[PDB]
């Protein structure tokens, strides 16, 4: 579990969304695993606008923060599950590090702010869904 709160928006994993997230829907995308909904209060998370390839992420299964090197956003094959069948997920970044299914929602950060959230993992690797291209979140 985990979400990003910026201004009047809430950013969550599409497969972990609630009934209140769908009733106050702004934008959704299956191939990215993302969902955005509206909120009454004003959030204070700073979203980064950069080309960084190193940062720090939170891992709830270990209760630790870990520094990692990661790849550029691209299409990567994701195996079948109970939420989505076998497909290619777009805007995905990979890193070497520990990960478990309950860790989806953990925030990735750099010196400029928020980069993305935990989405995929396994075999000793970890995947992050990028949010730096969505300029409408700041306006
Ligand atoms: C961080 O999640 C994991 C970590 C380790 C392992 Cl063995 C497995 C997982 C779970 C995982 O990758 N998915 C199941 C939920 C939907 C995800 C998606 N974005 O399509 C894919
Ligand atoms: Zn940066």
From Swiss-Prot:
It catalyses: Selective cleavage of Tyr-|-Gly bond in the picornavirus polyprotein. Disulfide bonds: none annotated. The active site is at residues 15, 33, 104. Zn(2+) 1 binds at residues 50, 52, 110, 112. Cysteine protease that cleaves viral polyprotein and specific host proteins. It is responsible for the autocatalytic cleavage between the P1 and P2 regions, which is the first cleavage occurring in the polyprotein. Also cleaves the host translation initiation factor EIF4G1, in order to shut down the capped cellular mRNA translation. Inhibits the host nucleus-cytoplasm protein and RNA trafficking by cleaving host members of the nuclear pores. Counteracts stress granule formation probably by antagonizing its assembly or promoting its dissassembly. Homodimer. This is Protease 2A. It comes from Coxsackievirus A16 (strain G-10).
